[model samples]
Target chain A: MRPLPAGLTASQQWTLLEWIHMAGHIETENELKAFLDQVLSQAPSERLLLALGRLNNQNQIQRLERVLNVSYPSDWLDQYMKENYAQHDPILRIHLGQGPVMWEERFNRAKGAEEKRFIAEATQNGMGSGITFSAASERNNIGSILSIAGREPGRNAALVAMLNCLTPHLHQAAIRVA
Target chain B: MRPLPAGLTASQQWTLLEWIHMAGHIETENELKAFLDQVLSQAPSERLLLALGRLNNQNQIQRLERVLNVSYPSDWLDQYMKENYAQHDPILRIHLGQGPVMWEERFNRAKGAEEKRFIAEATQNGMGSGITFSAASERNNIGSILSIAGREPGRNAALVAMLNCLTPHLHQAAIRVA
Candidate 1:
């Protein structure tokens, strides 16, 4: 009702508020996926993984190794973390001073056997192409990334902007409920 | 960018996003109050608290007994919880299906010595007047409330509407970093 921050339009605001309302009410992974579907509005066949974790100087890994939400088969996630694939995954390896990256661009940027293998295995796990928003806080030493992937199409600027705004909300909410 | 839920304006949305953006970035009570002051825009003397918690049928108490962010003196928070004052505090006693209730309005509805004493102690603790939004989910059995109180004037409909949109964001963020 008061004057707002400049640049966003009404519809953009409304959808995000709807998201905050839904995000606050959410409690389980199924509910979180429902909320994600409303914003990302993916293809029924699409798969997305939302992860939240601690950034430890104790280990050299640039990682999200804490609370993890996955719809991918449990084996894929377990094997991936157990194997520390994040060490090679392009989407997450870079520091978050830069973010909201298109997975394909990161994937295309991918080189080397391990990076190639990571992407190939992800596709085999049913996650091929999508986008990732990696949000991290240095003061708190916490980090999270929300990625929407599918073998087919569906990722754009509007949805990216929308999720860009909501990912922090998504991240903190996931910390509690995940 | 896309169709939106009806009834809110562009400015309202932008303000909420600024809040969501900030809430996501915040890592301290000092930062949270700075944000709370921006929306509530309270008197410099005004004090507020944001609390998040779980509900248990096992223990017959209605409460925000998990994570608490308090600017109230530690002794006050320590005493209240140790005393189990929630049993007598009107703002938290009733189940949340009834939605946000003004502290004054709920206090006026109060009867008996215990409730009156709780209010008196809260006032003495420096949170004399304020508004409370108690949001609870039955499915998750989690509840949270954000309230602004001070010895003097500073509360309005616009502020309430703004805080209403942002409280869920506030709640979830508090859960992780609190």
Candidate 2:
């Protein structure tokens, strides 16, 4: 994992705690959406994509829901679904293992022109490195994925660590809400 | 995990990066000791415990060596080995799961006199809250454990997150050195 370009200040740390406390209070899907929206607005990222899915015994996502930033392409998820990016996703790779991966590195692994074009366009449009999660092992059958894309290329270690710290709780809160 | 009362400053963040970078250069056990010693001196925490071990397939720690802060009780590890604190460890509890756990919470889970005494003494001696890990699935059949004990009782989310971010790298570097 890469160090955050700027270490979080005291106020930012308080904001993080507020986010964690708010996450635990989520009681519905709308609340979850509201929480994520507030987080995106307050935090230092340009875009976020939150996905929830069911994982079969084979550790494969059987069904999924995709939510994107307001300015993100309307057909982005559709294009993503057609291309089946999850299996090759860098965030997923790092999550499954104990290492770190960057989205640019994953994008470079894209073979076809379509995949290459999609990643290039996304990168140009301010969708950079992010992290993902698999909540299949948690309370619910739901497997959750999140991407917080920055305008820059490198991953933020502190931010990713904060999310990793909050993930299980998010899964639990989501399960409770759902 | 508990929130850090004070957020780590930018300089502290840099110190952490230096530690991670230095970890990769470790060529011997003495190097590891020097690295941990320097880290404890520069970091905010009151005490730190860095342990390296190998775990068998059944998830048991096969062999281990633990290092502690200078002012910490010399017999602490001996006491721990005698009482088998690994089985009762809160950090270990969270490691075995996918959640964040605090030392106080773990201490509260203590059910017997031995467990109670261990937590109580550790607390009295200012070894309050810490985190743990197992590189059981990582390279070299190694299982690593880390505990960043604060003089006070609460947990520090940012500090823990930094360590969590560095952990995989620490595991890899340890393996290479061993």
Candidate 3:
């Protein structure tokens, strides 16, 4: 028996929508951090932070740093919580892939025993259903934005399409940082 | 040694401009390919085809075949180009890196027999002035766009900035294919 996260029941929906809007317009590291901080205010921040940490996880990045003209901390990424496997983490992987997709039914597939165990545990801590998108850009930065709905899955492809369409503006913001 | 490529004059200018514009928008592969096909055409068909073939030599793509949904050749990128390692290609590492840079400086840098050899050959190819952008995407695909000014280097920063900008579009396109 775990305590329900304080933010889950009543505030989660509104908070998520707020972050979705914030994320959609985010153009800078400051904007992204702020968005993350806001999301952290309500729930766990480990996952997103973990994802960012993975950005410089290998040696081939040495030259790219010169290309991008930046440096990254070697172990700074570990503070986040990403599973190392390429498979199994299907949802996040889909979001990491391209073109917006609907996974309303995909979540339902998680009703099996192992998934149920994971969901039951996660839900108690305030984790919920999620959808992710790769934003547009004229340059080379690619980013993912996630929208979550508590307990129940959300499905709206047309809406997702509209949101994904905003990627170029988001990309402009990414290039500005570089 | 290589039969002087056909339409040498106009093709040279067209190639550089196309590389500029294409490098600026490399987040999407189809878009990049379309641009490549368009400009590479200014070359003799055989030469153009050879260039295309070389570019595609390592093509292991997967849009509909996204392995685990998130894998693309971009993920395999080690950042050799990002850190400006391309500056070392006797074939591409050096010649391509010079694309957007000034010819006078490059010519001045031509010290030593090897450097002189490369510079003189590049000069003959109208590559004394060149612009090169090593573009990448968040999704993982990485590449360079080379622009040559017949006898002098053009705008280097502009080409670099375009590389900075095109990361996402190419990555997304790579993701779709991956």
Candidate 4:
């Protein structure tokens, strides 16, 4: 598991919390899209993804296959599922533990053969270095991950700093609409 | 159960959804206070109360004895609990039924002896009329009621129309932090 991310600026904190509070009330697709657009618009990424699932004592992404809402490339997604790479997904493991993360940090921590293999596959699939955010709702038994790709490694810190405060609300809102 | 409250204007809908999405992200008390202040500032009311509780099939307010966050006038709130008047609160009943209701409409429908007695007591306690809003989180198995008092009857329609979209998020955010 990974350590907690850094703190956001006071103004950024307000923006992130505002987004978090808004998620629980989202009902319709259009409304959710708007919410995502407004929040994701600032992140320095092109493609973003959202996934909501159950979280137990174990951080099993394969078992966390309850509510997958957003999408990645179909081929990559099929390969991810078909190969069961979740077992070796370092980003997800740490994400379930603390919350926000930069893909590079998790990738660099990839020491095992399976872990390194999954990271290489992900990079080859055009998801090399970006940011992954997460939140766990103990009351609802729900956990969520919001991933954004296609950003420079330099931009990851800004995104992580912002999403460290946001991913929870983003996950909760996704569950509300889904 | 009462019918759905009136639809909000397009602009008002955006404002309400913004408020709703913001609720799920509230963590600290100061953040929650700011959120409440921003949202409640628009309503032409003096005092507002927020109550989160469990809702059974019967919609019994008296049985809703959990997670009461906001406050009311001490004397009236004391009498309400002492007399068990939640059993006779028509506004709360309909609020649990759909989502929002004007106290005046619910009071006018009050004909039962206990119901009428509760209404009279409420009016005499300086809470003559206002609006009550409710939201049910079937996913979390949580329900919440938000009441704003001292607004004019003329003001009730606008507030209800606006809150019909918001009350759910307000409830949702309360549960997240709680």
lDDT of each: 0.62, 0.54, 0.35, 0.65
- List TM-scores for all candidates, in order: 0.66, 0.42, 0.32, 0.63
- Estimate, for each residue in B51-144, the C-alpha lDDT of model 4 and write its tens digit: 7777665553544644343446777777887987767787667636375577877788778998888888889877778877787765545677
Best by TM-score: 1
For each candidate, the DockQ is 0.30, 0.03, 0.01, 0.26
Candidate 4 chain B: worst-modelled 10 consecutive residues by lDDT: B1-10
Model 3 lDDT per residue over A1-178, tens place: 0111222322332333233334333445776556545553453223332121012122111111111101112232221124332223344444332554344445566655655555554444444444444433213333333434332222443334333433333333344343
lDDT of 3 by residue, B32-66 (tens): 55654554344221111101101222431112122
Candidate 4's DockQ is 0.26
Candidate 4 local distance difference test against the native: 0.65
TM-score (C-alpha, index-matched) for candidate 1: 0.66
Docking class of 1: acceptable
**What is candidate 2's lDDT per residue for A1-178, written digit by digit as tens?**
2222346665555555555555544556777877778766754665666655665555445565444333245476565568776554444433321333457667667686656666675565455555454344422345555566663313555666556544544554555454
Off by over 4 Å in 3: A1-121, A132-178, B1-100, B108-125, B132-147, B151-160, B163-178
- Output the chain A TM-score of model 4: 0.74
> In model 4, which runs have C-alpha deviations exceeding 4 angstroms?
A1-22, A25-69, A81-84, A93-100, A104-115, A137-142, A152-166, A173-178, B1-22, B25-46, B52-69, B95-99, B108-116, B137-142, B152-165, B173-178
What's the candidate order when arranged by decreasing TM-score? Answer: 1, 4, 2, 3
- DockQ category of candidate 3: incorrect
- TM-score of chain A in every predicted structure: 0.71, 0.67, 0.40, 0.74
